[PDB]
Design a protein around this ligand. Structure first.
Ligand SMILES: CCCCCCCCCCCCCCCCC(=O)O[C@H](COC(=O)CCCCCCCCCCCC)COP(=O)(O)OCC[N+](C)(C)C
Ligand SMILES: CCCCCCCCCCCCCCCCC(=O)O[C@H](COC(=O)CCCCCCCCCCCC)COP(=O)(O)OCC[N+](C)(C)C
Ligand SMILES: CCCCCCCCCCCCCCCCC(=O)O[C@H](COC(=O)CCCCCCCCCCCC)COP(=O)(O)OCC[N+](C)(C)C
Ligand SMILES: CCCCCCCCC
Length: 241
């Protein structure tokens, strides 16, 4: 019966999430297209995305809690660097940190609704990684990125090593890295499971890092890695309620 509840929750999530992304999200872009004033059209679409990020977790009866909102740069783009432990990490970062570009599986272009919004956020689909050039290029024009240097979701919640050259997009653009630590989306929906289970999600936003202060990509990566990791640990251990 705890199984019944979770499955029904799962159905409720996919149904609402799909109708919301496709039909309401179609409607959103459709209204934004009709807007004379292009700057506020952008604001409208962006705000709706952020609202989706947030609303997502309400559809799961899962409470988000954010600290370090004050650290998120304003007037400027950045590269969110986060640990990765669920599909829900993307809606989480979108709704509570930044509505930026991300790197999608080639697959995703074909899924309706999602592709329109990945494109709107100026995302980057995956010779074998030409990606890196668009990301760099997009960064230079001013797009915020969201980057999961581990390169995969942790299977057990534990933070994996940051893949070598993972912070190269910061090094080669000079845009600030905004380290973020996510805890609880893994208990919500873990790698390889297709069902949800409610729970609390915590998010800790850390002080922006300037790549300028680092003799190499490899030294920056290590700094950000300890920062993120330590967050996860503090978050994993905090009692609350
Ligand atoms: C016949 C079927 C009719 C179903 C109509 C459902 C529309 C409800 C909209 C509503 O008022 O809730 C707001 C946002 O809605 C939502 O949370 C999502 C509504 C999506 C409905 C799709 C159903 C198919 C407030 O939440 P908030 O944004 O305040 O969320 C809490 C923070
Ligand atoms: C397939 C179609 C699905 C239809 C779902 C439409 C839900 C409308 C949500 C809404 O309140 O938008 C308002 C603007 O739209 C409207 O005033 C009318 C939209 C109705 C459209 C019907 C089908 C086309 C106010 O926005 P605001 O930008 O004022 O919201 C700020 C708060
Ligand atoms: C049958 C489908 C009927 C859809 C009815 C939608 C009711 C609109 C309620 C509403 O105004 O919520 C706004 C968000 O819109 C929505 O939640 C629209 C969801 C549309 C689903 C349509 C599926 C087909 C946010 O306003 P705000 O809460 O920001 O307004 C601030 C005051
Ligand atoms: C109302 C528009 C919602 C779009 C959510 C986008 C999710 C991007 C993966």
């Amino acid at each position: 019966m705890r199984k019944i509840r979770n499955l029904l929750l799962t159905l409720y999530f996919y149904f609402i999430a799909t109708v919301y992304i496709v039909f309401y999200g179609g409607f959103v872009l459709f209204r934004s297209f009709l807007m004379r004033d292009r700057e506020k059209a952008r604001k409208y679409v962006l705000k709706e995305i952020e609202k989706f990020g947030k609303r997502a977790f309400t559809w799961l009866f899962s409470d988000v809690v954010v600290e370090g909102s004050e650290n998120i740069p304003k007037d400027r783009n950045f590269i969110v660097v986060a640990n990765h432990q669920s599909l829900m990490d993307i809606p989480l970062i979108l709704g509570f940190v930044a509505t930026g570009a991300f790197i999608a599986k080639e697959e995703l272009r074909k899924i309706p609704g999602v592709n329109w919004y990945i494109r709107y956020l100026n995302g980057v689909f995956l010779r074998a990684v030409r990606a890196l050039r668009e990301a760099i290029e997009k960064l230079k024009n001013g797009v915020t990125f969201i980057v999961f240097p581990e390169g995969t979701r942790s299977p057990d919640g534990k933070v994996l090593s940051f893949k070598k050259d993972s912070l190269m997009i910061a090094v080669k653009t000079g845009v600030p890295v905004l380290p973020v630590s996510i805890w609880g989306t893994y208990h919500l929906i873990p790698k390889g499971r297709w069902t949800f289970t409610p729970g609390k999600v915590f998010l800790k936003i850390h002080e922006p890092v300037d790549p300028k202060g680092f003799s190499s990509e490899e030294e920056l990566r290590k700094y950000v890695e300890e920062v993120v990791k330590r967050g996860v640990e503090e978050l994993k251990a905090r009692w609350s309620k």
